[PDB]
Amino acid sequence: HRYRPGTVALREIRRYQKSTELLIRKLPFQRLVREIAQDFKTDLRFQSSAVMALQEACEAYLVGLFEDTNLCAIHAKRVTIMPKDIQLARRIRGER
Amino acid sequence: PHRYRPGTVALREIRRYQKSTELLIRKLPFQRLVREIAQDFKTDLRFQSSAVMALQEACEAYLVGLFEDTNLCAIHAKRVTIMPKDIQLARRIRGER
Amino acid sequence: HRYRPGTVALREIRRYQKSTELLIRKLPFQRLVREIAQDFKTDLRFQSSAVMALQEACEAYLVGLFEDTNLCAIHAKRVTIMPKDIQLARRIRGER
Amino acid sequence: ALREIRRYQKSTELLIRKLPFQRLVREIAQDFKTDLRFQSSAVMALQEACEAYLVGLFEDTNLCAIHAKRVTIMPKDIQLARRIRGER
Amino acid sequence: VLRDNIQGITKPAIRRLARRGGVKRISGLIYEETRGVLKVFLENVIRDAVTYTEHAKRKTVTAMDVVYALKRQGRTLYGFG
Amino acid sequence: NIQGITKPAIRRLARRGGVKRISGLIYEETRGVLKVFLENVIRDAVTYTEHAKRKTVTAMDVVYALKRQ
Amino acid sequence: RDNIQGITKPAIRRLARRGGVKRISGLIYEETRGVLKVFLENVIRDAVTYTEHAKRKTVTAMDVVYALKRQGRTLYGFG
Amino acid sequence: VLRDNIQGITKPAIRRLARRGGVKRISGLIYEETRGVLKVFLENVIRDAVTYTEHAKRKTVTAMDVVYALKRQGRTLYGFGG
Amino acid sequence: AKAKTRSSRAGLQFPVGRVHRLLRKGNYSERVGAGAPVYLAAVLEYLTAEILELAGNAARDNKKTRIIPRHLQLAIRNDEELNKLLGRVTIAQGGVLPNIQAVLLP
Amino acid sequence: TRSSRAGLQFPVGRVHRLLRKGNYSERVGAGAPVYLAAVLEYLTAEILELAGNAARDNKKTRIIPRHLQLAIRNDEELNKLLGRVTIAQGGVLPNIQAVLLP
Amino acid sequence: KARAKAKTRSSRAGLQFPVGRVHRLLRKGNYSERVGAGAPVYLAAVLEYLTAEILELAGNAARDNKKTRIIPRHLQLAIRNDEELNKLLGRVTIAQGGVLPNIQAVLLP
Amino acid sequence: SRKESYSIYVYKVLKQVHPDTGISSKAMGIMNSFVNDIFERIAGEASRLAHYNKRSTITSREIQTAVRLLLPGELAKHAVSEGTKAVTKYTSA
Amino acid sequence: KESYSIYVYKVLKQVHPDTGISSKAMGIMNSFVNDIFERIAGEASRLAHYNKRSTITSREIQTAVRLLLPGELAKHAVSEGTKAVTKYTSA
Amino acid sequence: SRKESYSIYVYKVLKQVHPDTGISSKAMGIMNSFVNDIFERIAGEASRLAHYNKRSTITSREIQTAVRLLLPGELAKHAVSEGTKAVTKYTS
DNA sequence: ATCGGATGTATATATCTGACACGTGCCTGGAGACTAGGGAGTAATCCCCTTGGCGGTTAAAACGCGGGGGACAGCGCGTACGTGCGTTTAAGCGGTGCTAGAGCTGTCTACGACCAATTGAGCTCGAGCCACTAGGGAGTAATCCCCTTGGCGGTTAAAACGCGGGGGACAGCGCGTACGTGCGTTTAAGCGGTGCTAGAGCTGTCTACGACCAATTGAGCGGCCTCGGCACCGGGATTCTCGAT
DNA sequence: ATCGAGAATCCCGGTGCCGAGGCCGCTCAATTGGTCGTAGACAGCTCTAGCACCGCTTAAACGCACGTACGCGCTGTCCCCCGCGTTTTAACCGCCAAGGGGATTACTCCCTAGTGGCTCGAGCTCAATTGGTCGTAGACAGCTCTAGCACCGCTTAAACGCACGTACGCGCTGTCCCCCGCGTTTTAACCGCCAAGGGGATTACTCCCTAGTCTCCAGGCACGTGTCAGATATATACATCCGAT
Structure with missing residues (x-):
């Protein structure tokens, strides 16, 4: 037998809501942070604590935004999140 | 027996009241609200009028901002009538609930 | 050999108060429930126990309404139950 | 004086004298418990409840009276109202 | 696929209901009036029920949806489920 | 003390309840009604105090005793 | 008391009109009242406590503006 | 291997983040959209952070610069240098 | 040793163990004391016995050995306390007490 | 006055006093209050220009709160700076959601 | 005229938290010109109190998870499941803490 | 395949009080609905009455x-009697 | 290089002696106490400044x-604080 | 009974920028609350980042x-220019 | 798109009044000036933690693909909401007390800063102790069969119906009773307090008592079969209405 | 209130059937025992606030009498409901099978049991405490005049209730996009060890900067004043919206 569409999705929801680890691969995020930082000032070093603080912040922010986006989607009587939902959510949030 | 199409004087009123710059609630019922509500927290308070007007300016500003957010939720669900689902979604997203 | 007006009537009152069976016919009430239910959802089926619950509720409610209405009718110095009485009864009951 | 309906229907203030009602509630309470004390907030809550209940019963009573083609309230009406409202 | 079934609540049936309720003489324009009342009552009990059924994510309303619907409306019913 | 609730007060209520004329037998009658209502609510109130190891009836106890109605 | 209902339905409608909404369902008029009440209950609660620390008995406009500022809603025009 | 790193945020990663947020079905044009929002969120915090380390006349962004930046922009973070 | 049911230690027919399980699962409290389910079971048995005697005598009075819904309805509706307790309930297949308003008689 | 040496209208002396007396630090540097005065005058001047042209375009000669509200809320950066702020008696920018037009 | 044995104000108040440190922080934090003598024992007392609240909730939360240490996840479960404490810390994110399990009901089978 | 009820216990009590009489299926459903209803009333009021008093345990009190609160008059006496007597008959394990 | 670690450990072993704390959770804890400190001291300084007094006292x-704490927290905290002050004044 | 404000200075700059136009009292209160607010922002942040680097003096840096940190974009740039200009003219 | 033809707003034109701009008078604070001494700047140096560097494995990303379920648009209906009118209501303008208390004052004590010296608490540093292969639960896809839906075929109970005439609805009427009112008399609620102390509400302490765990088993449950209690019938026996008088 | 008639129910003895009731095999929900951590009982204390009692005005309760509304019972007209026989309808039974869909089962995935980091002590150091001086915040009480309540008479905007109809909310239906589950293929993340130095951090050293104090005076606050900018009142001019062509 084979899984109906949208079952492994809820398995992943239970699994990752019960989980407590970082969900973005460490080194791509690290160079993302470094590349972004090079715009504001060049020739920068980072203590590892700093990039990991930035990753904890980033991921926390993104999961909260994703819950709000899911609420917008459900409010439109849907189950699929779409940029309509993200833009509506961070517009009520006042995030310009 | 002239009749305006349903919807005309509504946004006519929104044009009016958006260009206006005055308080939109009767100040004396609002004052009675402020007095009764405050009466629970401490007995026989006096209020300088400037203060009660500060509270009305704050209240009305808050409510019009909430109303634009709720209106945005309403249109996002592809209707035009705002209903409490919209208000609750809006406040839940701004972090009020 | 006609019976005087009003004696077969309370004969029927004794008979139906001593009885206990449902007094509205089964299949008409069943089709009524189906037609009414189509408004809220169209593809609805009903377990027979469910429609029987709904009929026991309906008939009970109607006999209670009829006894209260009888009380109002007598209160207006009458013996004939008429819509004045039922509307007063559901007014005070808060049934709007 | 149909004004009495005007006046008192527009009002929002207690219509039974406070402390006589206080002794009423206190005497009634003596059956259920000895040396009960009452904080004033409670006696005012149950007096407000009393007034609400009595005005609602009185509207229903007037509906019964009007339905009997009279204008004056009689125990017939209050008992009819309470025997269809689901009261004793 | 049904319509106009409120007339299906026959006049003798309503008459019987009144007789059990103790009514002796019943005016003629009540039989329609009663039907009206019945409809709205039923319309509510069913609607409540469906939300319970829809909440259990089924396609048949069970007797428990009826009993829950009635219990919320202050009319608890014994003998089903 | 049931007769403490006075005729002008019962009047004020019936008028608040929109009553034009009042048969004189109402007063005692409505007094009786008042009693039972109080007799019920008060009772529940005090069993909320007795359960709370208390000897004063707080207003919470009367709002819980009231919503039981 | 019981003053909340004193904020008329036309008023709520006006606030809504300034917020740009065209059509408004009826169960908002109650909802909004609730929304207002708790909101007010918070700011006023702050204000009076500001008064009580200052050992006064009149709530001043500065208590209101301080209450609003400490709730992330700064208000200009009163001091 | 330092340019275009916003693309390095794989679609599965975003998918996981979204799953933690409780979403069941995810449209495809979100995978770009979310990247955008993240790019800007991050763009703000680092900017604040960098000015802090630029004010202390150092050359390493410290964890305190990040946590101060996050507070400054209203998102207090517990667990890194108090 | 060999296990006994709590209902038997209590001297009850009704299931103390079931009542406890239902109390816990229904999330009425965080924690349920040990005397609660035996008490509650005791009261359910009491009321059950009350209605079952009155109904029993109803069926007996009506030349029948079996309790039918009507017997339960006659039992409750003629007992002031039960009729108050069960005032807003409807006994399916139970009918109504025989009652004709005197004004409607000849 | 120091404000004249710096070339600004705002009071360097007052702001200096405020910094010292204000529970910000113990020692207040000598260049701080003239910098702060300069920035406060700058922002003040900007919103006063935008408000000036708002009132003048309204054909009224005197700046009223509403003119400051239009000034702030129609300028991207200023709108961000004063985002969680509430201009009493200022009203709102005329804006009707396009989906609601006839 | 020898001294008395130095005893700490934190002990005089009956607190674990450091009244002396809290006092120093108050004075150095440029909050006032003057810090009252009873202020730091009050502040220390409250900081110790809240510490105790979240620390018990987190402690027995971890003990439900059958573990001997308190890890970030346990204290976040402590915070986000307490209405008042969650309200107080609504704008903070406990690093390495995760999120409360909750699936929107319409999405369940 | 199994679904629970109170049928065997109301039969036990029935044969305790009226050994000769029996019961039909519907009457059995009425009895079971009665037991469930009064259970939910008592447990409901007990839970709310624990909450009002900020106590986290539902006791026999x-x-x-x-x-x-729920039972009227004399019933509430016999109910309070039986319930307490049984608890003591249980306390002495 | 100081922190609040020893005091939160003391409170911990006071309330739940068997359980311990990881370093990360320890940083969460003292970061929390630091934040709430800055909140209380912030409001105290602001309302001391509002009423034109130069002393931040226990009042x-x-x-x-x-102002900051919600409901019963603010009540229970206030008890501790006042009781501590009294235990301090008499001692 | 003497309560200072910023009214005279916002009026001076106002006549610098629009000599013909004037200002209402209410708008004056908004202006003064605004300058008070932005003052509290800049001085607050200056004190905090002075406290972060152990320094004890709030200087122009x-x-x-x-x-x-607080002003957005071009506002911040122009402001930093104005501040340096005033400091440099003051020094000479 | 495009005329008439209403409707409502913008603008203008007149008039006027009070909010604003400027002087006038005062007084608090900012400006010089000066030294001390403390934080800040600079040098040298110490040492840690950031950065690289490279392959190797393989965990994860990317990709491809079949289908299935959900987005989405179109359409149909019913009823909630918007417009509009007439009536009612209280708001708000204006202008009046009166007195609670916000606001300013002086004064003298407490109390908190400031310092030196003294000690100990808290920090640091180093050392050393606390993945796989089963078996329950939780979801879940397949499969089982129970219970819903719909057809036969009628006959036959039960709805329909039509009609007269009996009686109850109802409208009016008359009259007598028993509310309503008004005004003179009183009485007790309400109100500002005091005097006292039961208890409430809070804190602290200690125990008893419920959560919690797999392992065991016997009470209860689905199945199944039997039989008598109960529904139903026919025909007589009783009682109960009806008419005439 | 009679008597015959006679209609309706009531009653009793027989028919037979279906569910009530009991045995049974068995499974799974309740029982069992020991820890232990903590909820709550209990006691005592702090001081709120509940209670009983003071007089004093005056608002209101109270006691009559008076004369009038109303309700209650009687009468006449008449409308329409009841009872009944005859026709018409479709309900009911039972039975039937097809199958939807809910129950039940068989997998499967998760989630535990089992075989390096965080606590503990030895050695300093930097900060907390001490206690005595000294100067000032601020405690405290009170005098004043602001300004906040309180009420009030008029007008008239605005709330309000409601009638009417269309436009929008909401569901239902069909189709086709496009996301998910899953297996295969392809990267590039992660990890493994390690050192060279950048740069953060310490330290030590002098010295520029700022606080702090006092006297001078002018810049800024508080009122007073006069007026013209805007407020208010009315009319017209113009931009619309509505419907029909």
Whole structure:
């Protein structure tokens, strides 16, 4: 037998809501942070604590935004999140 | 027996009241609200009028901002009538609930 | 050999108060429930126990309404139950 | 004086004298418990409840009276109202 | 696929209901009036029920949806489920 | 003390309840009604105090005793 | 008391009109009242406590503006 | 291997983040959209952070610069240098 | 040793163990004391016995050995306390007490 | 006055006093209050220009709160700076959601 | 005229938290010109109190998870499941803490 | 395949009080609905009455004050009697 | 290089002696106490400044605790604080 | 009974920018609350980042990094220019 | 798109009044000036933690693909909401007390800063102790079969119906009773307090008592079969209405 | 209130059937025992606030009498409901099978049991405490005049209730996009060890900067004043919206 569409999705929801680890691969995020930082000032070093603080912040922010986006989607009587939902959510949030 | 199409004087009123710059609630019922509500927290308070007007300016500003957010939720669900689902979604997203 | 007006009537009152069976016919009430239910959802089926619950509720409610209405009718110095009485009864009951 | 309906229907203030009602509630309470004390907030809550209940019963009573083609309230009406409202 | 079934609540049936309720003489324009009342009552009990059924994510309303619907409306019913 | 609730007060209520004329037998009658209502609510109130190891009836106890109605 | 209902339905409608909404369902008029009440209950609660620390008995406009500022809603025009 | 790193945020990663947020079905044009929002969120915090380390006349962004930046922009973070 | 049911230690027919399980699962409290389910079971048995005697005598009075819904309805509706307790309930297949308003008689 | 040496209208002396007396630090540097005065005058001047042209375009000669509200809320950066702020008696920018037009 | 044995104000108040440190922080934090003598024992007392609240909730939360240490996840479960404490810390994110399990009901089978 | 009820216990009590009489299926459903209903009333009031008093445990005291609240008059006496007598008959294990 | 670690460990072993704390959770804890400190001291300084007084006493600290803390927290905290002060004044 | 404000200075600059136009009292209160607010922002942040680097003096460098923190974009740039210009003219 | 033809707003034109701009008088604070001494700047140096560097494995990303379920648009209906009118209501303008208390004052004590010296608490540093292969639960896809839906075929109970005439609805009428009112008399609620102390509400302490765990088993449950209690019938026996008088 | 008639129910003895009731095999929900951590009982204390009691005005309760509304019972007209026989309808039974869909089962995935980091002590150091001086915040009480309540008479905007109809909310239906589950293929993340130095951090050293104090005076606050900018009142001019062509 084979899984109906949208079952492994809820398995992943239970699994990752019960989980407590970082969900973005460490080194791509690290160079993302470094590349972004090079715009504001060049020739920068980072203590590892700093990039990991930035990753904890980033991921926390993104999961909260994703819950709000899911609420917008459900409010439109849907189950699929779409940029309509993200833009509506961070517009009520006042995030310009 | 002239009749305006349903919807005309509504946004006519929104044009009016958006260009206006005055308080939109009767100040004396609002004052009675402020007095009764405050009466629970401490007995026989006096209020300088400037203060009660500060509270009305704050209240009305808050409510019009909430109303634009709720209106945005309403249109996002592809209707035009705002209903409490919209208000609750809006406040839940701004972090009020 | 006609019976005087009003004696077969309370004969029927004794008979139906001593009885206990449902007094509205089964299949008409069943089709009524189906037609009414189509408004809220169209593809609805009903377990027979469910429609029987709904009929026991309906008939009970109607006999209670009829006894209260009888009380109002007598209160207006009458013996004939008429819509004045039922509307007063559901007014005070808060049934709007 | 149909004004009495005007006046008192527009009002929002207690219509039974406070402390006589206080002794009423206190005497009634003596059956259920000895040396009960009452904080004033409670006696005012149950007096407000009393007034609400009595005005609602009185509207229903007037509906019964009007339905009997009279204008004056009689125990017939209050008992009819309470025997269809689901009261004793 | 049904319509106009409120007339299906026959006049003798309503008459019987009144007789059990103790009514002796019943005016003629009540039989329609009663039907009206019945409809709205039923319309509510069913609607409540469906939300319970829809909440259990089924396609048949069970007797428990009826009993829950009635219990919320202050009319608890014994003998089903 | 049931007769403490006075005729002008019962009047004020019936008028608040929109009553034009009042048969004189109402007063005692409505007094009786008042009693039972109080007799019920008060009772529940005090069993909320007795359960709370208390000897004063707080207003919470009367709002819980009231919503039981 | 019981003053909340004193904020008329036309008023709520006006606030809504300034917020740009065209059509408004009826169960908002109650909802909004609730929304207002708790909101007010918070700011006023702050204000009076500001008064009580200052050992006064009149709530001043500065208590209101301080209450609003400490709730992330700064208000200009009163001091 | 330092340019275009916003693309390095794989679609599965975003998918996981979204799953933690409780979403069941995810449209495809979100995978770009979310990247955008993240790019800007991050763009703000680092900017604040960098000015802090630029004010202390150092050359390493410290964890305190990040946590101060996050507070400054209203998102207090517990667990890194108090 | 060999296990006994709590209902038997209590001297009850009704299931103390079931009542406890239902109390816990229904999330009425965080924690349920040990005397609660035996008490509650005791009261359910009491009321059950009350209605079952009155109904029993109803069926007996009506030349029948079996309790039918009507017997339960006659039992409750003629007992002031039960009729108050069960005032807003409807006994399916139970009918109504025989009652004709005197004004409607000849 | 120091404000004249710096070339600004705002009071360097007052702001200096405020910094010292204000529970910000113990020692207040000598260049701080003239910098702060300069920035406060700058922002003040900007919103006063935008408000000036708002009132003048309204054909009224005197700046009223509403003119400051239009000034702030129609300028991207200023709108961000004063985002969680509430201009009493200022009203709102005329804006009707396009989906609601006839 | 020898001294008395130095005893700490934190002990005089009956607190674990450091009244002396809290006092120093108050004075150095440029909050006032003057810090009252009873202020730091009050502040220390409250900081110790809240510490105790979240620390018990987190402690027995971890003990439900059958573990001997308190890890970030346990204290976040402590915070986000307490209405008042969650309200107080609504704008903070406990690093390495995760999120409360909750699936929107319409999405369940 | 199994679904629970109170049928065997109301039969036990029935044969305790009326050994000769029996019961039909519908009457059995009425009895079972009665037991479930009064259970939910008593447990409901007990839970709320624990909450009002900020106490996290439903004790026999909560059940008995709830029973005093829901049952009318003399019933509430016998109910309070049986319930307490049984608890003592249980306490002496 | 100081922190609040020893005091939160003391409170911990006071309330749950068997359980311990990881370093990360320890940083969460003292970061928390640091934040809430800055909140209480912030409000105390602001309302001392509002009423034109140059002293932050136990009176300002308590009104700050009443403004920031929600419901019973603000009540229970206030008890501890006042009781501590009394235990301090008599000693 | 003497309560200071910023009214005279916002009026002076107002006549610098629009000599013909005037200002209402209410708008004056908004202006004064505004300058008070922005003052509290810049001085607050300046004090905090002075406290972060162990330094005990709020100088123009703390003011300017604070103004870079709080003011957005071109506002921040122009502000930092104005501040340096005033400081330089004052020094001479 | 495009005329008439209403409707409502913008603008203008007149008039006027009070909010604003400027002087006038005062007084608090900012400006010089000066030294001390403390934080800040600079040098040298110490040492840690950031950065690289490279392959190797393989965990994860990317990709491809079949289908299935959900987005989405179109359409149909019913009823909630918007417009509009007439009536009612209280708001708000204006202008009046009166007195609670916000606001300013002086004064003298407490109390908190400031310092030196003294000690100990808290920090640091180093050392050393606390993945796989089963078996329950939780979801879940397949499969089982129970219970819903719909057809036969009628006959036959039960709805329909039509009609007269009996009686109850109802409208009016008359009259007598028993509310309503008004005004003179009183009485007790309400109100500002005091005097006292029961208890409430809070804190602290200690125990008893419920959560919690797999392992065991016997009470209860689905199945199944039997039989008598109960529904139903026919025909007589009783009682109960009806008419005439 | 009679008597015959006679209609309706009531009653009793027989028919037979279907569910009530009991045995049974068995499974799974309740029982069992020991820890232990903590909820709550209990006691005592702090001081709120509940209670009983003071007089004093005056608002209101109270006691009559008076004369009038109303309700209650009687009468006449008449409308329409009841009872009944005859026709018409479709309900009911039972039975039937097809199958939807809910129950039940068989997998499967998760989630535990089992075989390096965080606590503990030895050695300093930097900060907390001490206690005595000294100067000032601020405690405290009170005098004043602001300004906040309180009420009030008029007008008239605005709330309000409601009638009417269309436009929008909401569901239902069909189709086709496009997301998910899953297996295969392809990267590039992660990890493994390690050192060279950048740069953060310490330290030590002098010295520029700022606080702090006092006297001078002018810049800024508080009122007073006069007026013209805007407020208010009315009319017209113009931009619309509505419907029909």
